Amino acid sequence: ADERLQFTATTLSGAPFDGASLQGKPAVLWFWTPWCPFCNAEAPSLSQVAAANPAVTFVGIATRADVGAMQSFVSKYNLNFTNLNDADGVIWARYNVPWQPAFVFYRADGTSTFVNNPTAAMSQDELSGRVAAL
């Protein structure tokens, strides 16, 4: 929320990205790793919900994998939004780690809600409703 978004990063494509650009608009952070079965179950839903909600800015944040594996996952699931190679877990630490998948749902006013459930993948219906609520 608010100042935690003040990070910089590198995308899987190698481009710089500034988290501060997310301030003041509805956004979703999604912390994933490519080998997690829950992340793999959620990825089609991220792809569809992001596509259907273009005025919400989605940013995936991947760690604990090589960049090629990250890229294969984005390609396989058509994740057409920024994905960050958080190679050393610094952004993950900022948002307090602990494992994947995790969502942060930001309103434009800076408030947020998190979902970090280890037992199940979030359904598309649930994700669509959380994104609409922003």
Swiss-Prot record:
GO MF annotation terms: antioxidant activity; oxidoreductase activity
Homology family: Belongs to the thioredoxin family.
Compartments it resides in: Secreted
A GO-annotated cellular component: extracellular region
Protein name stated in the entry: Soluble secreted antigen MPT53
Disulfide bridge positions per record: C36-C39
Gene transcribed to yield this protein: mpt53
Organism in which the protein naturally occurs: Mycobacterium tuberculosis (strain CDC 1551 / Oshkosh)
Range of the intact protein held here: 38 to 171 of 173
UniProt entry keywords in alphabetical sequence: Disulfide bond, Redox-active center, Secreted, Signal
Function: Disulfide oxidoreductase that catalyzes the oxidation of reduced, unfolded secreted proteins to form disulfide bonds. Despite a weak homology to thioredoxin this cannot serve as a substrate for thioredoxin reductase.
